[PDB]
C-alpha cells in the first residue's frame, strides 16, 4: 500500500475526457452546423455563475427554430435547463459531494418519444477513475434489472499510461436476456505534455485510434482513425490555430471532404462564426453562418464586460 | 436456450471484473518488473 | 485521346487542390493577418507609451 | 486487385501512419507560424 | 398490484413536474442567487436594458 | 440645299428647347434593379474570384472564377476583357466549352455597335447584333436575335426596335417593338411595349414605369437619401396573373457595401461586400424564405492582383 | 387564315411607327404651349 | 354574391404595398433610417 | 375560450420569431459595416490630430 | 442551292473560328497592347509573380 | 368603462359620414350621372309651407326610357320626420319615410310597387355615434316555415381611426328561396379627409370583384373637381374625371371619361322662378350624341311665400 | 296553416292600402300642417292661382 | 354538400365580426401610439 | 409575343389614367384652370 | 290693231315685277317655317368675315348626331356687286360650287355644280331674266346630247306674268329625258300669287304636274310678328297642313309650327353676344311619342382689325 | 264611314280653312303682344 | 309605240307655249273687261 | 267602365296639350321677357341721359 | 416613295381626325361654361354699378 | 368618233379641275380682293388673331 504511494501516480481523465483533445478540441464535429444561427446569452451573476441563453436557427435538421437554455453553477452544483419549441425539455444536473465524487442526472423529454433519463456516479481517485451510468432503469416483476448500465474504470499503471475498460449491459424488455459488451481503453501522455496517444477498441468490433499534438501555445494538431464482413473506416486529420481575436479549425477527411470553422471575435460582445464543408466525391457544399452576443444582466457585469 | 446466453453474458461480466482487478494489481507488477532489471 | 484524358485528369485534380487550398487558407490568412495587425497596434501603443 | 474490407483497413492504417509521420516531422512545425 | 399503481402514479406526477417545472425551478434558483434580483421581464428579455 | 437650311432651322428650334439625353432602355431600371437590388449579384454556395490587371491605359484584365454548390454558376470559368478608348471586348471560356463573347465598338461617343455570341455545345448558337444611337434628346436602338433569311427572301428571327424621347427635362416617354418569326411556316407576331421615366428636378428620385407586351408591368421608384445611402422599390406583375413587390436599400461606404431587400413573397435578402484589404475582399449573401422556412447562403471572395510591377505599386500605394 | 394574322401584325408595326412619330411630334407642341405660358 | 378574388386580390395587394412603400420612402422616417455620418 | 387565447399566443410567438430573425439578418451585417466605418473614421481623426 | 452550301460552309467555318479562337484573339490583343508583354505562363496564372 | 369612456373622449375624434355619404362629393356633387337624362323634361313644383317643408312636384318627360311620361311627387318634412311619395303613370308607387328618434339614430322605410313586378321594400336602421357609424338594412324580409331568414341583409360599420381617416366594412348576406343556402360578401371602406378640409380620398373594395377609388378636391369657394375609377375571368373598368363650377346664377358640370365619351350639364337660373337646364353627351368611339333639355318652375302655394320668393 | 292565411291576408290588405292611399296620406299631412289649408283643386294644380 | 357552403358563409360572417371588433379596438391602440410620440 | 389585349392591360390603363388625373388636379395647373373671380 | 294700243296701255297699266318661281313661297316655306333650318344633334358654325365691300367670309361647320349634316364642312363665299361665287368642301370630298353672275340688275346667269365622290356629278345651268312685268328662268340639269343630236337631261322653263298689280299667274314646264332609248316626259304646272293692297297678306298656290297641290298664306300682324299656313297634298292621295308663326326681335328669333301629322316644332335663336349666338330646335311627334332635339351655336368673327372694331362698336 | 283619299283631302281642306279663319281673325292680333 | 308618247309630249309642250302666250295676252283682256264695265 | 275610359282619354289629351303649351310657350316666354328686359334697360339709359 | 406617300396621307388623316375630336370636345366643354362665366361677370358688373351709384 | 374622245377627255379634265380647284379658286379671288391680304394660315384658321 505504501509502495503504491511511492510510485507517485497521477489521476487520469474520465472516460468522456479520453478523446477530449482530438474529438472535441481540435475537430469541429461537435461545432459544425448548417444554415444561419444566432446565439443570445446574458449573464446575471458570476460568483454563482448564472446565465440564460437564447438560440435562433433556420435551415438545419438538427438545430431547432427556437431554443432557450439557462444554466446555474456555484462551487459544487450545476443545473442546465433547455426548453425547445414543441416542448422538448432537456435537463442536466451535476452535484458535487466533493471535488472528487460527483453525481449527475440527465433527463430528456421529446413529447411523443419515450422519456430518456440517465443516472451517473463519478468517483475520481488519486490513480483511478470510476463511473457508473444507467440509462432508463427499470425492474421487472421477477426482480430483474431492465435498462442500460455502463460501468467503466481507468487506472494509471505508470505516470505516462492509463489503461482501463468499460462494460455495457443492455436488457430491453425482459423476455430476451440482455447482452454484455466489454471495451478497452488505452491512453499515453508524453513526458513533456506534447503529444497524447488515445486508443479504444469498442465492443462492436470498432476501433478508434487518435493522436493529439501541441506544436506551440497557439497551434495544435490531431488525427483520428475510426473503423468497424462489412468493415469501413474514416481517417480525419485536423488542426486548431487559436488566437486572441479568432479561432481557426481545419479538417481534412479521407471521405473526400474538407471542413473549416472560423470563430472571429470582432467585438467584446459580438462574435461572428463561420463553418464550411466541401464534399469532392459528390461535389457539394454545406455552409453555415452564425453569431454570438453575450450581454450582461446587471450594471456591474456591464462595466466588467467592456473594461 | 436463453440460459446458455445468460451464462455467456455472466461469464463475460466475470471476465471483465477479473481484467479490472488485474489492472488494479498491474502497477505493482509493472514496478516490480522494472525493479528486476 | 489518352493525352486529352491526362489533361482532363490533371485539370480536375488541379481544380480540387485549388479549391481545397483556398478553403483551408483564406480564413486562416484573414485570422493571421488580423492578429498581425493587432500585434502591430499593440507595439505602436507600447512605443507611444514609453 | 482485392477490393476487400482488408483493403480499406490497410488504406485507413496507411493514412494514419502517414499522418503520424507528417505531424511528428518538423514540417508540421514549418506549417506553424513563428509569431 | 396496488404498489405498481402507486409507483406509476407518482412517476407520472414526477414526469409532469419535471416536464413543466424544471427550467422555472432553475430560474428560481438563479433569481434567488442574484444580488440584483430582477423582475420577470428582464429575466426573459435578451436586452442589456438592466 | 433648301432642305438642309430648313433642317438647320429646325435643329436650332429644337436647340431652343434645351433638352437632355435620356438613358438607354437597358439603363431604364439601372438604379432600381442593378444598383439597389441584388438579383444580379445573388448566388448560392462558395465562390472565389481571381482577377489580375495587366494594364490600365488600355484596360485589360483576366479573371478566374471558381464556384461550387450552385446551378447557375459553373465550376470553372475564365473571362478576359479589353478596353481602349472606343472598343470593349469580353471573351469568356467555360468548362464543357460554353463560349460567351461580347464586343462593343464606338463609331462615336454616341453611336455604338455591339455583338453578342454564345455557343453552349449542344444548344443552338445564340447571337444578337445591336445598333444603339443616342441623339441629343432621344435614344434609338435596334437589336436582332438570330438573324436568318428564308428561301422566299423573308426575315426569320427576333427584331426589337426601341425609341425614347424626352418631352421635357424631367420626363422621357418611349416604346419598344418586338417582331418575332420562329420558322416561317407560322407568321411572326408583333408586340409593342411602353416606356415612361420621370426624373426629379434635383436628381433626388426617379420613377420608371414600363408596360410590357406580355401584359406585364414593372413600376419602380429610386431615391437617394444622402451621398452614401440609397433606396428603391419595384412592383413587377404578369389566365395567369401574379405579382411581386420588392423594397431594397443600399448603404455603401469606403470599406464595404451593404444591401438589404424585403420582398412581398415572404422572403428577405442581405448582401454584404466588405473590402478588408486593398487586394482581398470578402462577400456574403443570405436569403430567408418564411413561407416555406429555408435559407440560401453563399460566401465568396475576390482577389485583384496586378500583372506588371508599376500597377503592383499603384495598387497598394 | 394566316393572312389575317399577318395583316394584324403589320397593323401593329404600322401603329408602333405612328405612335413613335407622335412621340417625336409631342415635345415641340408641348414646348410651344410652355412658351405661351 | 360571392366571386373569385384571384386577379383583384393580388393586384390590389401589390398596388397597396407599392403605395405604402412609396409613402415610406418619401417620408422623413426614411431619412431617420439613414445614419448622420 | 382558452384555446383561442393559446392560438393567439402561438400566432404572436411565431410572428415575433419571424420579425426577430428578419431584424437580425437585416441588422447585424449593417451594424458590422457601420461600426467598421466608424472605426476607420476615428482612425483617420487620430491620424489627423497627431499630424497637426 | 450552291450558294446555300457556300454560305453554310463559311458559317460553319465562322462558327468553328469563333468557338476555338475568340478568347486567344482577345488575349493576343491584350498581350500586344501592353508595354511589358509577359510570356504565356504569366498571362494565364493568377499569381502576382510578374 | 367610465375610464375607458374618458379615454375615448381624450382622442377627440369626429363623426364620419354614412356609407351612402362616402362618395357623396365625387359621385353626386361633382358628377352628373344621377342628374343626366335624355329628351325633354319639365318640372313644376310648388311649395305650400316652409316651417314644415311641404311641396308638390309634377314631372313631364319625353324622349327617354328611364323617365316616365308623367310623375307626381310630394314630400313633407317637419323637424324629425321626412315622408316622400311618388305616383306614376301605370301606377308605380314609390314611398320613402325617414323618422328620427334622435338627431343620431334614424329609422327609414322604402317601398316600391311596379304593378306587375314583385313589391320591393327595405327596412333600414342607421345609427351615427360620436366616432362611428353603423347601419343595417334589409331588403324583402321574409321567414321560411323552418324559422330561417329569406331576403337580403346588409350591415356596415365605419370607425374613424384618427380625425383624418375612417376605416370600415359592409357585409351582405343574401338568401333567395331557402332551397339553396344564402351567400355572404364582405366589402371594405377607406376614407381620408385632409387637414384643411381641401381634398378627400375614398377607396372601396367591393365583394363582387369591383374596386372604386375616388378623389375630391376643392380648388376655391366656387369650383370643385373629382376623379373616380371603377373596375371589375371578366375584368373591365372606367375612369371619369369631372369638375363642377357653381355660381349664383348657374351651375356647370363637365365630365371626361376613359370610355371616349364627354358630358356636360348646365343649369342656368334665368328667373327667380324659372330655370333652364341642358345636358349633352358625345360618344366618340361610335360617334353619336345624347341631348336632353328641360326646365323647372318653382312656385308658391300661399300668398306669403309668393312675396317671399320674389322679394 | 291558419296563421299563414292570416298573415297573407293582412299583408295583402297592407299592400293594397300602401298602393292606393300612401301619397293621399302624405297630402293629408300636408293639408293638415298648413295655416292656409287650401281646397283640393289648389292642392293638385301647379298654378300659382292661390 | 350544402352544409360546407353554410359553414363557409358562417365563417365569413364571424370573420367579418372579428375584423369589425378589431377596427373598434385598433384606434385606441393607435392613440396609445400617438401618446408615445 | 403580345397575342392578347389582356385584362391586366386595361387595368394598368385605368390605373395610369387615375394617377395622371390625380397628378393633374393636385398640380397648380388645375389652379390655373380656375378663374380668379 | 291690238299691238300698238297694246304697247300704249300696257305701258299705261303700270304693272310691277313679281319675284322668281323660287321666291313664290319664300314667305311661308323659308321665312316663317323652320323646315329649311331644322336639324338634329349638335352643330357649331364658325364664320369669319375678311371684307365687306367685297363680301367675303369663310365658314366652318361642325355637326354630330345627324344624317344629313356631315361631320366637318368648310365653306367660303365671295360677293362683289354683280358676281356671287360659293365653294363648299366636305369630309370624304363632296364638292358643291355655285356661281351667280349679274349681266345686269335684271339679267343673271348661274351655275350649280355638285360632286359627291361615288355618285354622278350633278350640274345645272340657269338663266334668269326679270322683265318689267314678268320673270322667266330656264334651268338645265345634266345637259347631254345623243349621237342623233337629241337632248338628254332635264329642262325646266318657267314664266310668271302679272295680269294686275295684285295677281301674278305663271307656269313651269319640265321636260325630262333620261337615256334616249325612252322618250322623255313633259309636265306643266301652274302658279298663282295674290298680293294684298297694303302688303299685309299674300296668297300663293301652285298645282304641280304630279297632281300635287301646295296652297299657302302669309300674313304680317305687326312689324315683329308674322304667321303663315301651308297645305300640301298629292289612287294614293295624302297631305299635310302646317300652321306656323315667326316672332322676331333684335335679341331673339322665335319660330313655332303645328302640323296636322301630330307633331309640333320650335326654333329659338338667342343673340346673347354680338359675336356668339345660341340656337335651339325641337320636334315632338305625338303619334309615336318621340322627340328630336338639336342645339347649335354661331361664332361670327372678323379677319382684319377694322371689321373687328366695327363688329363690337 | 268613308276612309277614302277624299277623306284626307277634306280633312286638310277643313284644317286650311280653319287656319285661314284663325289668322285673319282679331284673335290672332290678340296672340300678338303689343310691344 | 314610242312615237305616240313623243307626239303626246310635243302636244303638251305646244299647249304650254300656247298657255304662256295667253298669259302674256291676259293683262290686255283683263283691262279691257275692266274698261267695259 | 265608360268613366275609366273617359278619365284616361282626358288625361292623355291634357298631357299632350300640356307638353304642347310648354314647348310652344316657354322659349317664346324667354324671348319676350328678355326683350322686355332690354327695353327696360334702354329706358333707364334714356332717362339717366336726359 | 409611294408607301411613304400613303404613310404621310394616313398621317394627315389621323391629324385631321384628332383635330376634329379635340375641337368638338373643347367646344362642348367650353361654350356653356363660357356663357356661365360671362353671365356671372355681367352680374358682378351690374352689382358694381348699383353699388357705386348708391354710394 | 375622235371628237367624242376629245370631248370626253376635256370633260374629264374639267371635272378634275372643278373637283380639286374650285374652292381654292374662290379663296384666291378672296385673297386677291382684300385690302389686308393675309397669309395662308390666317385665311384658314377660324381664330380672330388677325
Ligand atoms: C473556393 C471557395 C472558397 C470559399 C472561401 C470563402 C471565405 C469566406 C470568408 C468569410 C468568413 C470570414 C468572416 C470573418 O472573419 O468576419 C470578420 C471579417 C473581417 O473583419 P475585420 O478584421 O476587418 O474587423 C477588425 C475589427 N477588430 C480589429 C476589432 C477585430 O469581417 C467580415 O467578413 C464581415 C462579414 C461577415 C458575414 C456575417 C453574415 C451574418 C451572419 C449571421 C446572420 C444572422 C442570421 C440568424
Ligand atoms: C359640335 C358643337 C357642339 C357645341 C355645343 C352646343 C351647346 C349649346 C347649348 C347651350 C344651351 C343654352 C344654355 C342657356 O341657358 O341659354 C341661356 C339663354 C338665356 O340667355 P340670357 O341673355 O337671356 O340670360 C339673362 C339672364 N339674366 C336675366 C339673369 C341676366 O337662354 C336660351 O338660350 C334659350 C334656350 C331655350 C331652352 C328652353 C327649352 C324648353 C324645352 C321645353 C320642353 C318641355 C318638356 C316637356
Radius of gyration of chain D: 15 Å
Largest sheet of chain C: none
Tally the structural domains of chain D: 1
Roughly how many Å is the radius of gyration of chain C? 21 Å
Total DSSP helices of chain C? 1
Helix vs. strand class of chain D: mainly alpha
Structural class of chain C: mainly alpha
Helical proportion of chain C, percent range? over 70%
What's the overall geometry of chain D? rod-shaped
Hey, roughly how much beta strand do the residues of chain D contain? under 5%
> For the terminal residues of chain C, how far apart are their CA atoms?
71 Å
User: How many strand units of chain C?
Assistant: 0
PDB class: translocase
Keywords: Membrane protein, mitochondrial protein import, mitochondrial outer membrane, protein translocation, translocase
Assembly: eicosameric
Entry title: Cryo-EM structure of the mitochondrial TOM complex from yeast (tetramer)
Architecture blueprint of SSEs:
The complex is a hetero-oligomer of 20 chains, with 4 copies of chain A, 4 copies of chain B (37 residues), 4 copies of chain C, 4 copies of chain D and 4 copies of chain E (50 residues).
Chain A: H1 2-6, H2 20-26, E1 35-45, E2 49-58, E3 66-73, E4 77-84, E5 89-96, E6 102-109, E7 116-124, E8 128-139, E9 145-155, E10 161-171, E11 179-189, E12 195-201, E13 207-214, E14 219-227, E15 233-242, E16 246-253, E17 257-264, E18 270-279, E19 284-296, H3 299-306
Parallel strand pairs in A: 1-19
Antiparallel strand pairs in A: 1-2, 2-3, 3-4, 4-5, 5-6, 6-7, 7-8, 8-9, 9-10, 10-11, 11-12, 12-13, 13-14, 14-15, 15-16, 16-17, 17-18, 18-19
Chain B: H1 2-36
Chain E: H1 2-20, H2 22-32, H3 40-44
The complex binds 1,2-dimyristoyl-RAC-glycero-3-phosphocholine (2 copies).
